[PDB]
Design brief:
With 129 residues, the chain is mostly loops. It has a single domain, classed as Lysozyme (Orthogonal Bundle), CATH 1.10.530. The protein has 2 helices and 3 strands. It starts with 29 loop residues before the first helix and ends in a 14-residue tail after the last helix. Its EC number is 3.2.1.17. It catalyses: Hydrolysis of (1->4)-beta-linkages between N-acetylmuramic acid and N-acetyl-D-glucosamine residues in a peptidoglycan and between N-acetyl-D-glucosamine residues in chitodextrins. It holds the Pfam family Lys.
Length: 129
């Protein structure tokens, strides 16, 4: 499933992240354009020996189970690959928690400098709420 512009912006609020734990609608949408290019199928292995699974570029090392990354906490405890299907209904379980960790959105490399402080009111622009 390859999503359109206004095809990826409503299902995020459908799952409750709106201003989630101090994280608003303004902070989400840019990042997937820069981790997956609005793609659900973008698998890339980072030199850390981990791969980045899903549209969120998750490293199997800290949070999931891929079987080729030993010493991984596999904290989420699910198929690291279920993190890949069009049905994302369960992937954010670990998105809503990786942040209580307290070091922030700073778990991702691009939005931090590619997407922070930038005009965000604009990603939510041109669309209906």
């Amino acid at each position: 499933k390859v999503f359109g512009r206004c095809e990826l912006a409503a299902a995020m609020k459908r799952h409750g992240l709106d201003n989630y734990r101090g994280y608003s609608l303004g902070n989400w949408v840019c990042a997937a354009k820069f981790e997956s290019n609005f793609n659900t199928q973008a698998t890339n292995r980072n030199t850390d020996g981990s791969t980045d699974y899903g549209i969120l570029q998750i490293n199997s090392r800290w949070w999931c189970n891929d079987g080729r990354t030993p010493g991984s906490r596999n904290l989420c405890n699910i198929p690291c690959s279920a993190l890949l299907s069009s049905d994302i209904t369960a992937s954010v379980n670990c998105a809503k928690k990786i942040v209580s960790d307290g070091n922030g959105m700073n778990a991702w490399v691009a939005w931090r400098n590619r997407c922070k402080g930038t005009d965000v009111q604009a990603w939510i622009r041109g669309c209906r709420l």
